[PDB]
């Protein structure tokens, strides 16, 4: 009775850490594309652009 309830706890734990691995990979795939857009936008707008646009 205490090991089948340990099995019924772990099948509930089979859902949650698979959801937590799916969230952490969704953090990992979103931090990859924000690192690629920050590396491509190191150079900002120019100093002579701000004087002529304003």
């Amino acid at each position: 009775s205490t090991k089948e309830s340990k099995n019924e706890k772990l099948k509930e734990d089979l859902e949650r850490e698979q959801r937590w691995l799916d969230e952490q990979q969704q953090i990992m795939e979103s931090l990859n594309v924000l690192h690629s857009e920050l590396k491509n936008k190191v150079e900002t707008f120019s100093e002579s652009r701000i004087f002529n646009e304003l």
């Binding site: 090991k3 089948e4 340990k6 099995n7 772990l10």
Partner: protein, 50 residues
């Protein structure tokens, strides 16, 4: 002391189950319930380990 106790219990169960007695009609049912509960504990241990 536990090894002497388990050797005396093993020889006592050997001389018990050597001759068919009147307590066998509930002892065989008790061993069948213990082997079915142990088969459930084997399948639960294998699925819990995997």
């Amino acid at each position: 002391k536990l090894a002497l106790d388990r050797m005396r219990l093993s020889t006592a169960l050997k001389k018990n189950l050597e001759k068919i007695s009147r307590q066998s009609s509930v002892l065989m049912d008790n061993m069948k319930h213990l082997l079915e509960l142990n088969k459930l504990i084997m399948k639960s241990q294998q699925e819990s380990w995997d």
